[PDB]
Protein backbone atom coordinates (compact mmCIF):
# COMPACT_ATOMS: atom_id res chain seq x y z
CA UNK A 1 0.00 0.00 0.00
CA UNK A 2 1.06 3.59 -0.69
CA UNK A 3 -0.18 5.93 2.00
CA UNK A 4 -0.06 9.69 1.54
CA UNK A 5 1.22 11.70 4.50
CA UNK A 6 -2.27 13.17 4.86
CA UNK A 7 -3.81 9.67 5.06
CA UNK A 8 -1.30 8.52 7.70
CA UNK A 9 -1.92 11.57 9.88
CA UNK A 10 -5.68 11.24 9.48
CA UNK A 11 -5.70 7.59 10.59
CA UNK A 12 -3.31 8.04 13.53
CA UNK A 13 -5.13 11.19 14.69
CA UNK A 14 -8.53 9.53 14.40
CA UNK A 15 -7.42 6.43 16.30
CA UNK A 16 -5.92 8.53 19.09
CA UNK A 17 -9.14 10.52 19.53
CA UNK A 18 -11.64 7.67 19.81
CA UNK A 19 -12.13 5.38 22.78
CA UNK A 20 -11.75 1.87 21.38
CA UNK A 21 -13.35 0.48 24.56
CA UNK A 22 -16.41 2.60 23.70
CA UNK A 23 -16.54 2.15 19.91
CA UNK A 24 -15.85 -1.62 19.83
CA UNK A 25 -18.90 -2.69 21.85
CA UNK A 26 -21.05 -0.26 19.83
CA UNK A 27 -19.83 -1.58 16.46
CA UNK A 28 -20.20 -5.24 17.34
CA UNK A 29 -23.70 -4.77 18.74
CA UNK A 30 -24.53 -2.82 15.58
CA UNK A 31 -23.17 -5.67 13.41
CA UNK A 32 -25.26 -8.30 15.20
CA UNK A 33 -28.45 -6.29 14.68
CA UNK A 34 -27.90 -4.91 11.15
CA UNK A 35 -26.25 -8.10 9.79
CA UNK A 36 -27.97 -10.70 12.00
CA UNK A 37 -26.47 -13.79 10.33
CA UNK A 38 -23.29 -12.85 12.24
CA UNK A 39 -25.04 -14.16 15.38
CA UNK A 40 -23.88 -17.61 14.08
CA UNK A 41 -20.59 -17.02 15.91
CA UNK A 42 -21.86 -15.76 19.26
CA UNK A 43 -24.68 -18.04 20.39
CA UNK A 44 -22.62 -19.01 23.48
CA UNK A 45 -22.58 -15.32 24.49
CA UNK A 46 -26.06 -15.15 26.12
CA UNK A 47 -29.35 -13.47 25.13
CA UNK A 48 -29.30 -12.07 21.57
CA UNK A 49 -33.04 -12.46 20.83
CA UNK A 50 -33.84 -8.72 20.65
CA UNK A 51 -31.92 -5.52 19.83
CA UNK A 52 -32.10 -4.45 23.51
CA UNK A 53 -30.64 -7.77 24.68
CA UNK A 54 -27.73 -7.47 22.21
CA UNK A 55 -27.02 -3.87 23.19
CA UNK A 56 -26.96 -4.74 26.91
CA UNK A 57 -24.97 -7.95 26.45
CA UNK A 58 -21.67 -7.83 28.39
CA UNK A 59 -20.02 -10.72 26.50
CA UNK A 60 -20.71 -8.93 23.21
CA UNK A 61 -19.19 -5.78 24.74
CA UNK A 62 -15.94 -7.50 25.79
CA UNK A 63 -15.59 -9.11 22.34
CA UNK A 64 -16.13 -5.72 20.65
CA UNK A 65 -13.24 -4.40 22.73
CA UNK A 66 -10.90 -7.20 21.61
CA UNK A 67 -11.88 -6.58 17.93
CA UNK A 68 -10.92 -2.91 18.25
CA UNK A 69 -7.73 -3.65 20.13
CA UNK A 70 -7.02 -6.06 17.27
CA UNK A 71 -6.95 -2.99 15.02
CA UNK A 72 -4.34 -1.20 17.22
CA UNK A 73 -1.48 -3.14 15.67
CA UNK A 74 -2.61 -2.14 12.16
CA UNK A 75 -2.59 1.53 13.19
CA UNK A 76 0.84 1.04 14.85
CA UNK A 77 2.27 -0.17 11.54
CA UNK A 78 0.38 0.87 8.41
CA UNK A 79 3.07 -0.60 6.17
CA UNK A 80 2.89 -4.22 7.31
CA UNK A 81 -0.80 -4.93 7.81
CA UNK A 82 -0.79 -8.10 5.65
CA UNK A 83 1.74 -9.77 7.98
CA UNK A 84 0.09 -8.44 11.13
CA UNK A 85 -3.05 -10.45 10.39
CA UNK A 86 -1.68 -13.64 8.82
CA UNK A 87 -2.33 -15.81 11.88
CA UNK A 88 -5.63 -14.11 12.73
CA UNK A 89 -6.75 -14.82 9.17
CA UNK A 90 -5.87 -18.52 9.51
CA UNK A 91 -7.75 -18.62 12.82
CA UNK A 92 -10.97 -16.99 11.55
CA UNK A 93 -10.95 -19.37 8.58
CA UNK A 94 -9.88 -22.72 9.98
CA UNK A 95 -10.99 -22.59 13.61
CA UNK A 96 -13.85 -20.13 13.61
CA UNK A 97 -15.29 -20.63 10.09
CA UNK A 98 -16.18 -16.94 9.74
CA UNK A 99 -17.43 -15.85 6.30
CA UNK A 100 -14.90 -13.08 5.53
CA UNK A 101 -17.63 -10.93 3.99
CA UNK A 102 -18.56 -10.25 7.63
CA UNK A 103 -15.21 -8.44 8.06
CA UNK A 104 -16.42 -5.88 5.51
CA UNK A 105 -19.76 -5.56 7.31
CA UNK A 106 -18.07 -5.09 10.69
CA UNK A 107 -15.75 -2.45 9.20
CA UNK A 108 -18.83 -0.58 7.89
CA UNK A 109 -20.35 -0.65 11.40
CA UNK A 110 -17.09 0.74 12.83
CA UNK A 111 -17.28 3.60 10.32
CA UNK A 112 -20.87 4.33 11.39
CA UNK A 113 -19.96 4.36 15.08
CA UNK A 114 -16.88 6.54 14.54
CA UNK A 115 -18.93 9.01 12.46
CA UNK A 116 -21.59 9.14 15.20
CA UNK A 117 -18.97 9.79 17.89
CA UNK A 118 -16.87 12.40 16.05
CA UNK A 119 -19.51 14.21 13.96
CA UNK A 120 -19.30 15.38 10.35
CA UNK A 121 -16.77 18.20 10.75
CA UNK A 122 -14.11 16.21 12.61
CA UNK A 123 -14.90 13.04 10.61
CA UNK A 124 -14.64 14.98 7.35
CA UNK A 125 -14.78 13.46 3.86
CA UNK A 126 -10.95 13.31 3.68
CA UNK A 127 -10.74 11.63 7.11
CA UNK A 128 -13.33 9.10 5.96
CA UNK A 129 -11.34 8.53 2.75
CA UNK A 130 -8.25 7.61 4.80
CA UNK A 131 -10.17 5.50 7.32
CA UNK A 132 -12.00 3.62 4.54
CA UNK A 133 -8.65 2.88 2.87
CA UNK A 134 -7.33 1.62 6.23
CA UNK A 135 -10.34 -0.60 6.79
CA UNK A 136 -10.13 -1.99 3.26
CA UNK A 137 -6.48 -2.97 3.78
CA UNK A 138 -7.32 -4.62 7.11
CA UNK A 139 -10.30 -6.51 5.65
CA UNK A 140 -8.16 -7.71 2.75
CA UNK A 141 -5.49 -8.88 5.22
CA UNK A 142 -8.03 -10.73 7.38
CA UNK A 143 -9.32 -12.59 4.31
CA UNK A 144 -5.92 -13.31 2.79
CA UNK A 145 -5.34 -16.81 4.26
CA UNK A 146 -8.74 -18.24 3.33
CA UNK A 147 -8.35 -21.19 0.93
Amino acid sequence: VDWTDAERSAIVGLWGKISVDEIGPQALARLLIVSPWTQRHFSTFGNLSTPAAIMGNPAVAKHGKTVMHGLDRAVQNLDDIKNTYVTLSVMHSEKLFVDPDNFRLLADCITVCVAAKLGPAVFSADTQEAFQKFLAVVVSALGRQYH
Binding site: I33, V34, P51, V112, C113, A125
Partner: protein
Protein backbone atom coordinates in the same frame (compact mmCIF):
# COMPACT_ATOMS: atom_id res chain seq x y z
CA UNK B 1 -39.63 -5.84 2.10
CA UNK B 2 -40.26 -3.20 4.77
CA UNK B 3 -42.36 -4.14 7.78
CA UNK B 4 -44.75 -1.66 9.38
CA UNK B 5 -42.07 -1.16 12.07
CA UNK B 6 -39.39 -0.44 9.41
CA UNK B 7 -41.67 2.10 7.75
CA UNK B 8 -42.42 3.75 11.10
CA UNK B 9 -38.69 3.91 11.93
CA UNK B 10 -37.82 5.47 8.55
CA UNK B 11 -40.54 8.12 8.95
CA UNK B 12 -39.37 8.89 12.51
CA UNK B 13 -35.74 9.46 11.62
CA UNK B 14 -36.74 11.45 8.50
CA UNK B 15 -38.47 13.86 10.92
CA UNK B 16 -34.93 14.76 12.01
CA UNK B 17 -33.36 14.59 8.55
CA UNK B 18 -35.87 16.81 6.73
CA UNK B 19 -34.87 20.20 8.24
CA UNK B 20 -31.27 19.46 7.22
CA UNK B 21 -32.02 17.77 3.87
CA UNK B 22 -29.90 19.97 1.55
CA UNK B 23 -26.88 19.77 3.88
CA UNK B 24 -27.22 16.02 4.34
CA UNK B 25 -27.40 15.56 0.55
CA UNK B 26 -24.28 17.61 0.03
CA UNK B 27 -22.48 15.62 2.73
CA UNK B 28 -23.56 12.22 1.39
CA UNK B 29 -22.71 12.99 -2.23
CA UNK B 30 -19.38 14.63 -1.25
CA UNK B 31 -18.38 11.53 0.69
CA UNK B 32 -19.40 9.19 -2.11
CA UNK B 33 -17.20 11.12 -4.55
CA UNK B 34 -14.14 11.49 -2.27
CA UNK B 35 -14.23 8.18 -0.37
CA UNK B 36 -15.32 6.07 -3.37
CA UNK B 37 -13.70 7.94 -6.28
CA UNK B 38 -14.81 5.19 -8.73
CA UNK B 39 -18.08 7.11 -8.73
CA UNK B 40 -16.45 10.26 -10.18
CA UNK B 41 -16.57 8.55 -13.61
CA UNK B 42 -20.15 9.80 -14.00
CA UNK B 43 -19.57 13.44 -13.03
CA UNK B 44 -16.60 14.62 -15.12
CA UNK B 45 -18.91 17.10 -16.92
CA UNK B 46 -19.31 19.13 -13.70
CA UNK B 47 -17.12 22.17 -12.95
CA UNK B 48 -16.08 20.49 -9.71
CA UNK B 49 -16.46 17.27 -7.73
CA UNK B 50 -15.00 18.85 -4.59
CA UNK B 51 -16.91 18.61 -1.29
CA UNK B 52 -19.21 21.60 -0.86
CA UNK B 53 -18.68 22.89 -4.42
CA UNK B 54 -21.63 24.38 -6.34
CA UNK B 55 -22.29 21.30 -8.49
CA UNK B 56 -22.09 18.95 -5.49
CA UNK B 57 -24.45 21.11 -3.43
CA UNK B 58 -26.90 21.29 -6.36
CA UNK B 59 -26.92 17.59 -7.05
CA UNK B 60 -26.92 16.73 -3.32
CA UNK B 61 -30.27 18.53 -3.19
CA UNK B 62 -31.55 16.64 -6.24
CA UNK B 63 -30.67 13.29 -4.65
CA UNK B 64 -32.01 14.07 -1.19
CA UNK B 65 -35.23 15.62 -2.47
CA UNK B 66 -35.89 12.35 -4.28
CA UNK B 67 -35.09 10.20 -1.26
CA UNK B 68 -37.28 12.48 0.93
CA UNK B 69 -40.12 11.89 -1.59
CA UNK B 70 -39.54 8.14 -1.45
CA UNK B 71 -40.23 8.12 2.32
CA UNK B 72 -43.84 8.96 1.33
CA UNK B 73 -43.99 6.08 -1.17
CA UNK B 74 -42.82 3.14 0.93
CA UNK B 75 -45.84 1.03 -0.02
CA UNK B 76 -44.78 1.06 -3.69
CA UNK B 77 -41.21 2.25 -4.13
CA UNK B 78 -40.77 0.39 -7.42
CA UNK B 79 -43.67 2.12 -9.21
CA UNK B 80 -42.61 5.49 -7.80
CA UNK B 81 -39.10 5.04 -9.14
CA UNK B 82 -39.88 3.63 -12.62
CA UNK B 83 -39.15 6.79 -14.63
CA UNK B 84 -36.01 7.50 -12.57
CA UNK B 85 -34.81 3.93 -13.09
CA UNK B 86 -35.30 4.35 -16.84
CA UNK B 87 -33.34 7.62 -16.71
CA UNK B 88 -30.38 6.07 -14.87
CA UNK B 89 -30.39 2.97 -17.10
CA UNK B 90 -30.99 4.37 -20.57
CA UNK B 91 -29.98 8.04 -20.45
CA UNK B 92 -27.17 8.10 -17.86
CA UNK B 93 -26.01 4.48 -18.19
CA UNK B 94 -25.00 4.21 -14.52
CA UNK B 95 -23.74 0.78 -13.40
CA UNK B 96 -26.36 -0.07 -10.76
CA UNK B 97 -23.79 -1.40 -8.26
CA UNK B 98 -23.14 2.25 -7.40
CA UNK B 99 -26.54 2.70 -5.76
CA UNK B 100 -25.48 0.85 -2.60
CA UNK B 101 -22.39 3.07 -2.41
CA UNK B 102 -24.57 6.17 -2.10
CA UNK B 103 -26.76 4.34 0.44
CA UNK B 104 -23.72 3.60 2.64
CA UNK B 105 -22.56 7.20 2.58
CA UNK B 106 -26.03 8.50 3.43
CA UNK B 107 -26.08 6.12 6.42
CA UNK B 108 -22.70 7.45 7.59
CA UNK B 109 -23.99 11.02 7.30
CA UNK B 110 -27.20 10.31 9.20
CA UNK B 111 -25.13 8.73 11.99
CA UNK B 112 -22.85 11.79 12.08
CA UNK B 113 -25.75 14.28 12.28
CA UNK B 114 -28.08 12.32 14.57
CA UNK B 115 -25.92 10.05 16.77
CA UNK B 116 -28.41 9.58 19.62
CA UNK B 117 -31.35 8.92 17.28
CA UNK B 118 -29.47 6.60 14.88
CA UNK B 119 -29.64 3.47 17.03
CA UNK B 120 -28.88 0.03 15.53
CA UNK B 121 -32.63 -0.62 15.09
CA UNK B 122 -33.15 2.67 13.21
CA UNK B 123 -29.98 1.92 11.19
CA UNK B 124 -31.41 -1.49 10.23
CA UNK B 125 -34.69 -0.01 9.01
CA UNK B 126 -32.94 2.80 7.09
CA UNK B 127 -30.62 0.25 5.47
CA UNK B 128 -33.60 -1.89 4.45
CA UNK B 129 -35.28 1.20 3.00
CA UNK B 130 -32.22 2.33 1.06
CA UNK B 131 -31.61 -1.20 -0.25
CA UNK B 132 -35.16 -1.30 -1.60
CA UNK B 133 -34.68 2.16 -3.09
CA UNK B 134 -31.51 0.91 -4.83
CA UNK B 135 -33.36 -2.13 -6.20
CA UNK B 136 -36.21 0.08 -7.41
CA UNK B 137 -33.64 2.22 -9.25
CA UNK B 138 -32.19 -0.95 -10.79
CA UNK B 139 -35.56 -2.36 -11.89
CA UNK B 140 -35.68 -0.99 -15.46
CA UNK B 141 -32.13 -2.08 -16.34
CA UNK B 142 -31.37 -4.57 -19.16
Amino acid sequence: SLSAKDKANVKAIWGKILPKSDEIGEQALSRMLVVYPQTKAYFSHWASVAPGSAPVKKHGITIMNQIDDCVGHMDDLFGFLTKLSELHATKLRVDPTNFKILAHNLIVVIAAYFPAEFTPEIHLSVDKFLQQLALALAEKYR
